Amino acid sequence: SMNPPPPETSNPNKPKRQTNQLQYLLRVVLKTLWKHQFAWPFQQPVDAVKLNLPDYYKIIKTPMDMGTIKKRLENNYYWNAQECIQDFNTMFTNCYIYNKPGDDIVLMAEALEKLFLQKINELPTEE
Ligand SMILES: CCn1c2c(c(=O)[nH]c1=O)[C@H](c1ccc(C)cc1)C1=C(COC1=O)N2
């Protein structure tokens, strides 16, 4: 099978705005996770073709990744912070569903998610 098209990262028909919370998600939350030693499997859409995982997109129908999130934030694609938080959660959940508990990639995701949840407790109040 071919890869699917990646998630959209811009849409002229989708209203957009900047908020202090979305700015924080880009400058602090994404920045922190993106540069983490365990980030690399999550920095781009899953390339099931190159990686040889012919069942990935038969199993995962809600793909999401930090490369997509990074572009959505940079492009001001989101209207609210919850949209972005949901994308991170979807990314982690996909990993936990596709892979076996105890697999190294699951441990990587869990470490990233722990950090993620800490940082979103620090979300600033909306101005
Ligand atoms: C996020 C998508 N994904 C990936 C892999 C996987 O086993 N399961 C999976 O859900 C695979 C891999 C294998 C072992 C480790 C320690 C990390 C990553 C892999 C990537 C990218 O490069 C790769 O070697 N992604």
Angle subtended at Cα 41 by Cα 40 and Cα 42, rounded to the nearest 5 degrees: 90
C-alpha–C-alpha distance, residues 10 and 31, integer Å: 20
Is the residue at 12 inside a domain? no
**How close is the Cα of 105 to the center of ligand 1, in Å?**
6
Look at residue 6 and tell me if it is in a domain: no
Specify whether the CB–CB gap between 14 and 72 falls below 8 A: no
**Determination method here?**
X-ray
CATH of the domain at 39: 1.20.920.10
Which residue, by CA, sits nearest to atom 17 of ligand 1?
A: 105
Pocket test for ligand 1, best of 105, 106, 108, 110 (most atoms within 8 A of CB): 105
Tell me the C-alpha distance between 69 and 77, whole Å.
9
**Are 124 and 29 in contact, with CB atoms under 8 Å apart?**
no
Residue with tokens 């940079």: 74
Instruction: Report the distance separating Cα 71 and Cα 37, nearest Å.
Output: 20
Half-sphere exposure of 7 (CA within 13 A, CB side): 22
Measured in angstroms, the resolution is 1.5
- At 26, which amino acid appears? L
Q: Whose CA is nearest to atom 21 of ligand 1?
A: 41
Q: How far is the CA of 3 from the centre of ligand 1 (A)?
A: 15
Which residue segment(s) compose the domain that 112 sits in?
A: 19-123
